[PDB]
Design a protein around this nucleic acid. Structure first.
Ligand SMILES: [Mg+2]
Ligand SMILES: [Mg+2]
Ligand SMILES: [Mg+2]
Ligand SMILES: [Mg+2]
Ligand SMILES: [Mg+2]
Ligand SMILES: [Mg+2]
Ligand SMILES: [Mg+2]
Ligand SMILES: [Mg+2]
Ligand SMILES: [Mg+2]
Ligand SMILES: [Mg+2]
Ligand SMILES: [Mg+2]
Ligand SMILES: [Mg+2]
Ligand SMILES: [Mg+2]
Ligand SMILES: [Mg+2]
Ligand SMILES: [Mg+2]
Ligand SMILES: [Mg+2]
Ligand SMILES: [Mg+2]
Ligand SMILES: [Mg+2]
Ligand SMILES: [Mg+2]
Ligand SMILES: [Mg+2]
Ligand SMILES: [Mg+2]
Ligand SMILES: [Zn+2]
Lengths: 138, 208, 157, 226
RNA sequence: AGCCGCGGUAAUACGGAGGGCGCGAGCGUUACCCGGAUUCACUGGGCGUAAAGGGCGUGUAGGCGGCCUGGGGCGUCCCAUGUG
RNA sequence: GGGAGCAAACCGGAUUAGAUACCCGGGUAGUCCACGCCCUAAACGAUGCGCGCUAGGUCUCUGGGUCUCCUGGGGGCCGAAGCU
């Protein structure tokens, strides 16, 4: 059966990228939309568009990449070098503020669900609250 | 106790002059000056590569000997700079200079460090106007290292209080030649002390 | 003009009719302690013929390093084989804590301070280009907000 | 000079290759399958031919030395008389793994040809016992064979020029390493990210080859006044 | 002799000497605790051949779960406070 | 109950230094049916079970369609990315 709405998205966009696909499409949530508006507030992704695939509700996320590298492997650099989820289901993860970690020595982002919603450790701590710790990009 | 034995041989062990013989150690005598190679039966033969840990240790030993204090508390002085808020290389030394037995040897009042100690041990020294027999002595900024009047007219004090009209102190220090006094301005910097140690290499021996 | 430490040497066996035959292999670093650093791995019939050769491969196998106050810009981890290499910036005064082989490579590349562990399989050679790669992959507070965002850069900055 | 949709067609440039021997990444570049065997979109060769002549025109304005690579038995003597006109170096005969990541080890073999041309001029050759004479003769032509384009390559080329990035995906993979740029003529059976400056068109059409070189080797000489 | 190991007439390994390194009123050996040991693996592991997927199903306790809005606030976050 | 043929144990012959075997000529259990037990296996893809995502190429069985081809479900081989 299908279990994780969330972790799924990451893994689309994970497997999507590491192929260098220009665009990719994910099962329209409210969550998946608010997590997504972050991922472009913080330029990992160009942006998501709402598109209906087969009269079914959906989100079309466009993929951000590196620039044409040279060498013998001319394949850029996912602006998304690693994305992966922490609160796994039945194994959840709630951090205060004290407990909010920072990611890649400040070079990176942790995503939160809080009483004020869809938050980055920066936006998180600036606000002075916390909650379910979700994923982790860089 | 303290190490006590053939000092100019570590003038040569780690391969550079350690001015611990003292006033002889500016001759064409101090042992190094003659024969650079370090001690026994083999000292002249070809020396192979030093282990990563060799070097790790050499440059620690140098700084331990060169300052003339024994291991067991060379440690609690390291491990007391670790425990203290700032650069570890640079705090360390900082509380080698604050020790009494090398508060003298840089304030003039002696020929070498091993000597300079004797004068501390033996009731000869004034600290904010009092008598201190304690090489283990934490000299703070503003302290008063002088000499008790009674010893003043001693040759060893004086031939050494002599020569100081041809030298200078060390910029964390005022020497009062005539009044037989001395003043601890501040701590040092790693700016000042130009020792022949590399200190991070010391700390990389107290990581393992 | 490149200062160059040496990591490890070994004698390896071939075989043949009547007795073995050999070859020796030499792990070598390089590096102007301010930025750069190479590695080689050299095989040759007599030893320092190899140690010399290993120095060659390192000159081409160079890695500029983002360096920042003698330390490592962010945290980091990489696998390569079953040998799992860790780095992580240390502050002024903590200095090349790292076993045998990162020390050799990190030092010469120019690190003052760093923290470090080695994992599972410990074979030098893996942990060698374990870390040659760990370092090929360091990324900078500017190299970076001009990987992302930089879609429309110089409107941002 | 310039080039149009009109001209490319008659050549067999839309004339792709199979679907059974096929590279997926070649996507973007097609129309469809009029008889199972693909049709190249030449309104997307007008794209990658503009840009991939600009880059050649710059190199003849900053006087670049451009390698020519074609080994496919029809290609050869068209690589030839289209490099010769250009003043160029060409690997027509058979590529060697090395000739770029080993230019020295190879080029110790040009001089051994240039030495032997001159050895055969003088009379001192005839003095050597005639066993070596015919023997050392053989070696002359061997070198004239696989190199009569390599000789004028005295250093390493500013761009290599392939006609099949899958036959000599060898060559392409050398200039991959030693950061030379790559200029390839490719149908569908060929990885197209392995090229920076790329022409989608026919591999084996001895008239598709023919136009494209003889229209490249113009925007060489024209760009070198003459 | 802690580990692999040295000794069968050239022993840097055993016993002595000279020389050497480390420590110093202590230096060693034995016993136990933790680290090493991401070799109990929350951080931080694995099963095709390396130790390891139940010989195959069914289904109970239990664990877990798709899209849209609203009520509760048990969890989880937040602030003040009493305690520690 | 059934027993043609095969065939542990067993009876002979041959080989070999010896042959409790390999080879040969017979031979009960048993394999066969029933009904109840036994409940192991190199029970093997040596890969527990569902769902979502990630170049394709040919082959082969089986379905549906505007059947030059498109699209479902299977069994095979070669290969992208990636794993090892
Ligand atoms: Mg004591
Ligand atoms: Mg008295
Ligand atoms: Mg592994
Ligand atoms: Mg292991
Ligand atoms: Mg002997
Ligand atoms: Mg002995
Ligand atoms: Mg543990
Ligand atoms: Mg394991
Ligand atoms: Mg097994
Ligand atoms: Mg089993
Ligand atoms: Mg739910
Ligand atoms: Mg709700
Ligand atoms: Mg509550
Ligand atoms: Mg029988
Ligand atoms: Mg029966
Ligand atoms: Mg039965
Ligand atoms: Mg049974
Ligand atoms: Mg059993
Ligand atoms: Mg099974
Ligand atoms: Mg199939
Ligand atoms: Mg592969
Ligand atoms: Zn001396």
């Amino acid at each position: 059966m299908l279990t994780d709405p969330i972790a799924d998205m990451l893994t689309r966009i994970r497997n999507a990228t590491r192929v260098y696909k220009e665009s990719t499409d994910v099962p329209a949530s409210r969550f998946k939309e608010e997590i997504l508006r972050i991922l472009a507030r913080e330029g990992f992704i160009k942006g998501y568009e709402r598109v209906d695939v087969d009269g079914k509700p959906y989100l079309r996320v466009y993929l951000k990449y590196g620039p044409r590298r040279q060498g013998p492997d001319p394949r850029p650099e996912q602006v998304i070098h690693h994305i992966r989820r922490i609160s796994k289901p039945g194994r959840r993860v709630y951090v205060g503020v004290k407990e909010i970690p920072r990611v890649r020595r400040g070079l990176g982002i942790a995503i939160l669900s809080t009483s004020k919603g869809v938050l980055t450790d920066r936006e998180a701590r600036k606000l002075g609250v916390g909650g379910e710790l979700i994923c982790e990009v860089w | 106790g303290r190490y006590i034995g053939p000092v100019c041989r570590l003038c040569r062990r780690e391969g550079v002059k350690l001015y611990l013989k003292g006033e002889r150690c500016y001759s064409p005598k101090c042992a190094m000056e003659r024969r650079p190679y370090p001690p026994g039966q083999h000292g002249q033969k070809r020396a192979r590569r030093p282990s990563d840990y060799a070097v790790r240790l050499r440059e620690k030993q140098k700084l331990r000997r060169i300052y003339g204090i024994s291991e067991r508390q060379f440690r609690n002085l390291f491990e007391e700079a670790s425990k203290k808020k700032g650069v570890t290389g640079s705090v360390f030394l900082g509380l080698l200079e604050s020790r009494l037995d090398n508060v003298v040897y840089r304030l003039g009042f002696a020929v070498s460090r091993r000597q300079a100690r004797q004068l501390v041990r033996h009731g000869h020294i004034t600290v904010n106007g009092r008598r201190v027999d304690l090489p283990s002595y934490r000299v703070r900024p503003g302290d008063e290292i002088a000499v008790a009047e009674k010893s003043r007219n001693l040759e060893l004090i004086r031939q050494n209080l002599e020569a100081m009209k041809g030298r200078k102190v060390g910029p964390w220090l005022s020497l009062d030649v005539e009044g037989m006094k001395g003043k601890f301005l501040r701590l040092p910097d790693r700016e000042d002390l130009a020792l022949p140690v590399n200190e991070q290499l010391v700390i990389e021996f107290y990581s393992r | 003009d490149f200062e160059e430490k040496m990591i490890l040497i070994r004698r390896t066996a071939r075989m043949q009719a009547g007795g073995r035959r050999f070859r020796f292999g030499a792990l070598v670093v390089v590096g102007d302690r301010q930025g750069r650093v190479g590695l080689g791995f050299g095989k040759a019939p007599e030893v320092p013929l190899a140690v010399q050769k290993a120095g060659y491969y390192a000159r081409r196998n160079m890695v500029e390093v983002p360096l920042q106050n003698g330390t490592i810009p962010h945290e980091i981890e990489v696998e390569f084989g079953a040998s799992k290499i860790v780095l992580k910036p240390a502050a002024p005064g903590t200095g090349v804590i790292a076993g045998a082989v990162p020390r050799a490579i990190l030092e010469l590349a120019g690190v003052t301070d760093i923290l470090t562990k080695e994992l599972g399989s410990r074979n030098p050679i893996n942990i060698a280009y374990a870390t040659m790669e760990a370092l090929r992959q360091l990324r900078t507070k500017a190299d970076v907000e001009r990987l992302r965002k930089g879609e429309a850069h110089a409107q941002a900055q | 000079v310039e080039i149009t949709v009109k001209e490319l067609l008659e050549a067999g440039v839309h004339f792709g290759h199979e679907r059974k021997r096929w590279n997926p990444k070649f996507a973007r570049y097609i129309y469809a399958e009029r008889n199972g065997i693909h049709i190249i979109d030449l309104q997307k060769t007008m794209e990658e031919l503009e840009r991939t002549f600009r880059f050649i025109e710059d190199l003849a304005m900053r006087g670049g030395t451009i390698l020519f690579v074609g080994t496919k038995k029809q290609a050869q003597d068209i690589v030839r008389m289209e490099a010769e006109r250009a003043g160029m170096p060409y690997v027509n005969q058979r590529w060697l793994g090395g000739m770029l990541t080993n230019f020295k080890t190879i080029s110790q073999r040009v001089h051994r040809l240039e030495e032997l041309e001159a050895l055969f001029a003088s009379p001192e050759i005839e003095e050597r016992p005639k066993k070596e004479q015919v023997r050392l003769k053989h070696e002359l032509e061997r070198l004239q064979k696989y190199l009569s384009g390599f000789r004028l390559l005295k250093r390493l080329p500013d761009a290599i020029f392939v006609v099949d990035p899958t036959k000599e995906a060898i060559a392409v993979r050398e200039a991959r390493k030693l950061f030379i740029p790559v200029i390839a003529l490719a149908d569908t059976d060929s990885d197209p990210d392995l090229v920076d400056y790329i022409i989608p068109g026919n591999d084996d059409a001895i008239r598709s080859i023919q136009l494209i070189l003889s229209r490249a080797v113009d925007l060489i000489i024209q760009a070198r006044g003459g």
